[PDB]
Curated annotation (Swiss-Prot), chains A, B:
It is linked to Macrocephaly, neurodevelopmental delay, lymphoid hyperplasia, and persistent fetal hemoglobin: An autosomal dominant disease characterized by pharyngeal lymphoid hypertrophy, with adenoid overgrowth, sleep apnea, macrocephaly without structural brain abnormalities, and impaired intellectual development. An increased fraction of fetal hemoglobin has been observed in some patients. This is Zinc finger and BTB domain-containing protein 7A. The chain holds residues 9 to 128 of 584 of the full protein. Homodimer. Interacts with BCL6. Interacts with RELA; involved in the control by RELA of the accessibility of target gene promoters. Interacts with AR (via NR LBD domain); the interaction is direct and androgen-dependent. Interacts with NCOR1. Interacts with NCOR2. Interacts with SMAD4; the interaction is direct and stimulated by TGFB1. Interacts with HDAC1. Interacts with SP1; ZBTB7A prevents the binding to GC-rich motifs in promoters and represses the transcriptional activity of SP1. Interacts with the DNA-dependent protein kinase complex/DNA-PKc. The BTB domain mediates the interaction with the androgen receptor/AR and HDAC1. Also mediates the interaction with SP1. Residues 26-88 form the BTB domain.
Length: 115, 115
């Protein structure tokens, strides 16, 4: 009968972030403005519908031309840590990018912060 | 400045569990007592030191002969949901398996439940 581990999902995420930090067990590179982001297909697909569609339908490197390197870094950081670092002036920029990547947790929140 | 998402890691884990359930974006198969478990290398490595060592050092299928299919199913379920389903009689069995896979969250708890 289910022993609950309330810290487990965050411990998992931390471990995946360690992998990302260390360039370990990353199976895809996102390329944005000439900048490369080694990540996990699976983690991206679990929080972005753009990426789920992309990976469940090039081969190791995928270019994104419709978000800034700066927004993608903030959103990839969010994906892997559960914290979105944003300044008051940039909320609308992150909203625009999260809608295009279809990361609804971030889109809903940022839209609420703008009215 | 970090907007915190307290539900995000569990939403990520849920998404990875969906992938596992649906056989999507799984990059390894664990083989135990003739039974195959499509999973993610990255998720296994984030919670088991046995698996982190295994994957950061065959190629798509990895046999485990030192835990039961029944214990591995319970521990893989835990890995992907943050709940360990166990009966009162099986705590010691799961403890034995978690120590061999080096899943310290489960080992510490099960040892405490046995004294
Ligand atoms: Pr960790
Ligand atoms: Pr307003
Ligand atoms: Pr206004
Ligand atoms: Pr989900
Ligand atoms: Pr006692
Ligand atoms: Pr006793």
């Amino acid at each position: 009968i289910g022993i609950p581990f309330p810290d487990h999902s965050s411990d998992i995420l931390s471990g995946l972030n360690e992998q990302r930090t260390q360039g370990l067990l990353c199976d895809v590179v996102i390329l944005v403005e000439g900048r490369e982001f080694p990540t996990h297909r699976s983690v991206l697909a679990a929080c972005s519908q753009y990426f789920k569609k992309l990976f469940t339908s090039q081969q190791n490197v995928y270019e994104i031309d419709f978000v800034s390197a700066e927004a993608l870094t903030a959103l990839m950081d969010f994906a892997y840590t559960a914290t979105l670092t944003v300044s008051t002036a940039n909320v609308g920029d992150i909203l625009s990018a999260a809608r295009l990547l279809e990361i609804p947790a971030v889109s809903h929140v940022c839209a609420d912060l703008l009215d």
